[PDB]
Scaffold this active site. Structure first.
Site, PDB file in Angstrom:
ATOM      1  N   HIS A 175       0.898  -1.231  -0.012  1.00  0.00           N
ATOM      2  CA  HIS A 175       0.012   0.130   0.002  1.00  0.00           C
ATOM      3  C   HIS A 175       0.876   1.078   0.051  1.00  0.00           C
ATOM      4  O   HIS A 175       0.356   2.448  -0.070  1.00  0.00           O
ATOM      5  CB  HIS A 175      -0.989  -0.085   1.072  1.00  0.00           C
ATOM      6  CG  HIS A 175      -0.396   0.182   2.395  1.00  0.00           C
ATOM      7  ND1 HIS A 175      -0.308  -0.956   3.481  1.00  0.00           N
ATOM      8  CD2 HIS A 175       0.011   1.230   3.400  1.00  0.00           C
ATOM      9  CE1 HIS A 175       0.389  -0.351   4.532  1.00  0.00           C
ATOM     10  NE2 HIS A 175       0.523   0.882   4.349  1.00  0.00           N
ATOM     11  N   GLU A 184      19.528   7.567   7.583  1.00  0.00           N
ATOM     12  CA  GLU A 184      18.709   8.572   8.458  1.00  0.00           C
ATOM     13  C   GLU A 184      18.523   8.352   9.832  1.00  0.00           C
ATOM     14  O   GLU A 184      18.263   7.214  10.472  1.00  0.00           O
ATOM     15  CB  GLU A 184      17.219   8.715   7.727  1.00  0.00           C
ATOM     16  CG  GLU A 184      17.456   9.247   6.225  1.00  0.00           C
ATOM     17  CD  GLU A 184      17.431  10.812   6.202  1.00  0.00           C
ATOM     18  OE1 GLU A 184      16.882  11.449   5.260  1.00  0.00           O
ATOM     19  OE2 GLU A 184      17.985  11.456   7.191  1.00  0.00           O
ATOM     20  N   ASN A 232      17.516  11.873  11.931  1.00  0.00           N
ATOM     21  CA  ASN A 232      16.618  13.046  11.755  1.00  0.00           C
ATOM     22  C   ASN A 232      16.323  13.204  10.338  1.00  0.00           C
ATOM     23  O   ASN A 232      17.183  13.440   9.750  1.00  0.00           O
ATOM     24  CB  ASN A 232      17.293  14.199  12.281  1.00  0.00           C
ATOM     25  CG  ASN A 232      16.492  15.483  12.454  1.00  0.00           C
ATOM     26  OD1 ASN A 232      15.634  15.639  11.653  1.00  0.00           O
ATOM     27  ND2 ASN A 232      16.894  16.406  13.434  1.00  0.00           N
ATOM     28  N   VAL A 246      16.953  17.034   8.687  1.00  0.00           N
ATOM     29  CA  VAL A 246      17.866  17.645   8.648  1.00  0.00           C
ATOM     30  C   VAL A 246      19.069  16.893   8.076  1.00  0.00           C
ATOM     31  O   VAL A 246      19.232  15.687   8.486  1.00  0.00           O
ATOM     32  CB  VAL A 246      18.461  18.308   9.996  1.00  0.00           C
ATOM     33  CG1 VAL A 246      17.523  18.900  10.879  1.00  0.00           C
ATOM     34  CG2 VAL A 246      19.467  17.630  10.737  1.00  0.00           C
ATOM     35  N   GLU A 274      23.507  10.062   5.381  1.00  0.00           N
ATOM     36  CA  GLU A 274      22.753   9.912   4.514  1.00  0.00           C
ATOM     37  C   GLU A 274      23.115   9.264   3.107  1.00  0.00           C
ATOM     38  O   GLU A 274      24.167   9.644   2.453  1.00  0.00           O
ATOM     39  CB  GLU A 274      21.756  10.813   4.242  1.00  0.00           C
ATOM     40  CG  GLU A 274      21.067  11.309   5.464  1.00  0.00           C
ATOM     41  CD  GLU A 274      21.708  12.539   6.012  1.00  0.00           C
ATOM     42  OE1 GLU A 274      22.854  12.765   5.746  1.00  0.00           O
ATOM     43  OE2 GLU A 274      21.067  13.156   6.961  1.00  0.00           O
ATOM     44  N   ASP A 319       0.200  -7.888   1.639  1.00  0.00           N
ATOM     45  CA  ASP A 319       0.610  -6.185   1.627  1.00  0.00           C
ATOM     46  C   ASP A 319       2.262  -6.291   1.679  1.00  0.00           C
ATOM     47  O   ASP A 319       2.608  -5.852   2.785  1.00  0.00           O
ATOM     48  CB  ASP A 319      -0.034  -5.689   2.600  1.00  0.00           C
ATOM     49  CG  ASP A 319       0.133  -4.208   2.787  1.00  0.00           C
ATOM     50  OD1 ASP A 319       0.693  -3.522   1.728  1.00  0.00           O
ATOM     51  OD2 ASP A 319      -0.150  -3.645   3.767  1.00  0.00           O
ATOM     52  N   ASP A 353       2.293   1.012  20.036  1.00  0.00           N
ATOM     53  CA  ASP A 353       1.821   0.698  18.915  1.00  0.00           C
ATOM     54  C   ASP A 353       2.445   1.370  17.633  1.00  0.00           C
ATOM     55  O   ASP A 353       3.226   2.541  17.970  1.00  0.00           O
ATOM     56  CB  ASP A 353       0.331   0.810  18.807  1.00  0.00           C
ATOM     57  CG  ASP A 353      -0.315  -0.239  17.932  1.00  0.00           C
ATOM     58  OD1 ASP A 353      -1.858   0.214  17.378  1.00  0.00           O
ATOM     59  OD2 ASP A 353       0.142  -1.036  17.114  1.00  0.00           O
ATOM     60  N   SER A 354       2.415   1.042  16.683  1.00  0.00           N
ATOM     61  CA  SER A 354       2.801   1.548  15.364  1.00  0.00           C
ATOM     62  C   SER A 354       1.650   2.620  14.879  1.00  0.00           C
ATOM     63  O   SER A 354       0.511   2.190  15.322  1.00  0.00           O
ATOM     64  CB  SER A 354       3.209   0.407  14.346  1.00  0.00           C
ATOM     65  OG  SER A 354       1.940  -0.304  13.923  1.00  0.00           O
ATOM     66  N   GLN A 376       0.421   6.040  11.855  1.00  0.00           N
ATOM     67  CA  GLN A 376       0.563   6.749  10.664  1.00  0.00           C
ATOM     68  C   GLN A 376       1.913   7.169  10.316  1.00  0.00           C
ATOM     69  O   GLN A 376       2.310   7.739  10.906  1.00  0.00           O
ATOM     70  CB  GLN A 376      -0.349   7.680  10.103  1.00  0.00           C
ATOM     71  CG  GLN A 376      -1.855   7.240   9.625  1.00  0.00           C
ATOM     72  CD  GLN A 376      -2.793   6.579  10.583  1.00  0.00           C
ATOM     73  OE1 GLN A 376      -2.187   5.704  11.587  1.00  0.00           O
ATOM     74  NE2 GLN A 376      -3.893   6.905  10.528  1.00  0.00           N
ATOM     75  N   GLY A 377       2.639   6.695   9.142  1.00  0.00           N
ATOM     76  CA  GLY A 377       3.829   7.049   8.975  1.00  0.00           C
ATOM     77  C   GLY A 377       4.813   5.923   8.960  1.00  0.00           C
ATOM     78  O   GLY A 377       6.154   5.952   8.740  1.00  0.00           O
ATOM     79  N   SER A 426       4.310   2.701   8.187  1.00  0.00           N
ATOM     80  CA  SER A 426       4.022   1.664   7.325  1.00  0.00           C
ATOM     81  C   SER A 426       5.111   1.140   6.397  1.00  0.00           C
ATOM     82  O   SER A 426       5.942   2.220   6.215  1.00  0.00           O
ATOM     83  CB  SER A 426       2.816   2.076   6.264  1.00  0.00           C
ATOM     84  OG  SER A 426       1.671   1.500   6.491  1.00  0.00           O
ATOM     85  N   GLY A 427       5.238  -0.037   6.247  1.00  0.00           N
ATOM     86  CA  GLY A 427       6.366  -0.557   5.377  1.00  0.00           C
ATOM     87  C   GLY A 427       7.777  -0.809   6.212  1.00  0.00           C
ATOM     88  O   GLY A 427       8.533  -1.534   5.836  1.00  0.00           O
TER      89      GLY A 427
HETATM   90 CA   LIG Z   1      18.863  13.503   7.991  1.00  0.00          CA
END
Ligand SMILES: [Ca+2]
Lengths: 56, 221
Positions: B40, B52, B54, B57, B62, B84, B169-170, B172-173, B175-176
């Site tokens: 999804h 990553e 933060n 910034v 990265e 899924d 819990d997990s 929104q954001g 996912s995956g």
């Molecule tokens: Ca960063």
């Protein structure tokens, strides 16, 4: 009228920014969509939103 | 992640952020050129961000790499959410702060546990997205309790993890993102009913059932 329905995030956990027509404000606003089970008042752009629901 | 804690810079080396102009989903690096996430989370124009902490910034560790291919499971059902799972091929290999996570040899049992991580919402009632990576230890729950919590919605390819009391819990954001147990990738953050609600644990894609599909798919693409 699906254009008058409140935005539906759904059960999935993504944080995808979509648009919905806000009949009270008379404009399309953004909201967070979870990634699945979208209702019809959910658009990928403000332009699509206005074309489909604008002035409802 | 609701009720979790700050992981600490690059302590979860396999965690990646899927970016489409902003963070929208997580994922796990399982190969120098491959990432596993939720079906999804499929979107065109995905940029994968590795190393990553933060996400707001640039800190120097990265690696931003565009996806060249996104393969959603052929049997993914957007309605039932069954299967899924999705594979994302990186346009170029990542330089392994950044490391891959191992696929499981066997499925994990109830009670195991696991570490769930992500940059999702941290509030049950409300909105608050963090800058740094959040972590959470939650146990895998039994199939029966999972099925009792979500009648007729749990398939053999999903498992519940968390606490029936709620509060952890997990969300929104997330996912995956990864659910790692005993150093192996056992789950993918998928869905739930609200966040951190009592008697409504999070639901995850059972990775152990897709290992052969994953290996063969990576190899023929
Ligand atoms: Ca960063």
């Amino acid at each position: 009228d699906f254009c008058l329905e409140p935005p539906y995030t759904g059960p999935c956990e993504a944080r995808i920014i979509r648009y919905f027509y806000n009949a009270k404000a008379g404009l399309c606003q953004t909201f967070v969509y979870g990634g699945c089970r979208a209702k019809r008042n959910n658009f990928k752009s403000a332009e699509d939103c206005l074309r489909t629901c604008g002035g409802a | 992640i609701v009720g979790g804690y700050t992981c600490g810079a690059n302590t979860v080396p396999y965690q990646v952020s899927l970016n489409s102009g902003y963070h929208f989903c997580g994922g796990s690096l399982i190969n120098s050129q491959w990432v596993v996430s939720a079906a999804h989370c499929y979107k065109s124009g995905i940029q994968v961000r590795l190393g990553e902490d933060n996400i707001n910034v640039v800190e120097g560790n990265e690696q931003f790499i565009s996806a060249s291919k996104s393969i959603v499971h052929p049997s993914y059902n957007s309605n039932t959410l069954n299967n899924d799972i999705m594979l994302i091929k990186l346009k170029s290999a990542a330089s392994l702060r950044v490391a891959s996570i191992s696929l499981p040899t066997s499925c994990a049992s109830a009670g195991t546990q696991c570490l769930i991580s992500g940059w999702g919402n941290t509030k049950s009632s409300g909105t608050s997205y963090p800058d740094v990576l959040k972590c959470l230890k939650a146990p895998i729950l039994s199939d029966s309790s999972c099925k009792s919590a979500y009648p007729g919605q749990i398939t053999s390819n999903m498992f519940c993890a968390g606490y029936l009391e709620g509060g952890k819990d997990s969300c929104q954001g997330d996912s995956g993102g990864p659910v790692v147990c005993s150093g192996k990738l056992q789950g993918i953050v998928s869905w739930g009913s609200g966040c951190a609600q009592k008697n409504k644990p999070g639901v995850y894609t059972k990775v152990c059932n897709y290992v052969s599909w994953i290996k063969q798919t990576i190899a023929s693409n």
